């Protein structure tokens, strides 16, 4: 493995102060670093660490061409939608994972940070779209959605609606409606330059 010693900047991904709204989900090209995943996988911090196309035990031996770390805040009952072959308004219109995905979908309950007594509404999701997303498609587009045959002409009306709904996280909403921060660590395996590496000597 390469003559490199700098630890992965997972600190800038997980313990970041501000997370993206899922409709505008953030991405970081994690690269050129030694990524220890055991400190993540073994933590009690996370409420799920399920992985696809790889085993969380094994992957500390692996090396990859890059990690894309994607992150967003979603509802508790929407965490299930962040998985291959799933359906729902998040998977269809906000964040689509490919069938052949390989990676880990990490989530933890973040109600202590992402809710306020008067409700937090800064976290926002696309409720309406014409057609489902392609895998890792991302449209920040604010353009008003038209549901009917009647043209909307940029004014909200009886069959055309502003496409984004605020989640509304009050501290009281319960475990299913509380906010969860999600990180989707995605891998690609093929290429000759191994660029993010395990802690093997």
């Amino acid at each position, epitope marked *: 493995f390469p003559n490199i010693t700098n630890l992965c900047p997972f600190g800038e991904v997980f313990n970041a102060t501000r997370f993206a709204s899922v409709y505008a989900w953030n991405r970081k090209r994690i690269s050129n670093c030694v990524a220890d995943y055991s400190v993540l996988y073994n933590s009690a911090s996370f409420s799920t660490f399920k992985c696809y196309g790889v085993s969380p035990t094994k992957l500390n031996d692996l090396c990859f061409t890059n990690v894309y770390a994607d992150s967003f805040v979603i509802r508790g009952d929407e965490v299930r939608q962040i998985a291959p072959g799933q359906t729902g308004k998040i998977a269809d219109y906000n964040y689509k994972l490919p069938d052949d995905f390989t990676g880990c979908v990490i989530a933890w309950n973040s109600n*202590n*940070l992402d809710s*306020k*007594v*008067g409700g*937090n509404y800064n976290y926002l999701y696309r409720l309406f779209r014409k057609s489902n997303l392609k895998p890792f498609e991302r449209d920040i587009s604010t353009e008003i959605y038209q549901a009917g045959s009647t043209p909307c002409n940029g004014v909200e009306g009886f069959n055309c609606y502003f496409p984004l709904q605020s989640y509304g996280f009050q*501290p*009281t909403n319960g475990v299913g409606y509380q906010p969860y921060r999600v990180v989707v660590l995605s891998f690609e395996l093929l290429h000759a330059p191994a660029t993010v590496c395990g802690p093997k000597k």
Partner: antibody
Amino acid sequence: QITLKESGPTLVKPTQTLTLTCTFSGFSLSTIGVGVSWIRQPPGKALDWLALIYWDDDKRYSPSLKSRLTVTMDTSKNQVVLTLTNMDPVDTATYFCAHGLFSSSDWGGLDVWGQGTTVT
Amino acid sequence: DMQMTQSPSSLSASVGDRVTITCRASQSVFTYLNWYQQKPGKAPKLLIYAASRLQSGVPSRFRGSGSGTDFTLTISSLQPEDFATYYCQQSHSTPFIFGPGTKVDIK
């Protein structure tokens, strides 16, 4: 210094902005959970909650004044200013700015208040 | 919408008496309700953070109770300096409307 605050002018004319200010000490209003809320009281009448600004610049207004009321801040001066845009004499009142705590651990207790100012 | 009312719009009382003040909140407010007292021309003082949660700097004769839609405040035995007007506040639905106030009368 322990948490303390004050408020601005008292002279009013009707078709004018009230252009109040509030200024404070002992809290940053940038620490997570800190908020400051505006409460008015007509003389000998109920309290009337006007508005609240949180940390991270989230703003809330009383719905019947939302079209007619704005609040804004300066993280550097430790000031908040409220500008009700046009006094109708029902708006004559004492105005207060009160501190509170508003994060997930907190309860929105308006725990310390300024002495407030009359508006004529 | 949200609305907030208090049952004894004024209550006659005397020193040493038990007294109780009652708040009805239209929607479920959970425990996010506050109690304030005001002496005329002074700013209100917060007494209760949340139902049953007493402030520091407030004597043990003040306590409150309830949850959801109906809430209560109780003073076990009035000192004469406790005579004031009392306001509830809800701290959950985004306009934190106060109640109409309840004044205790020496009468």
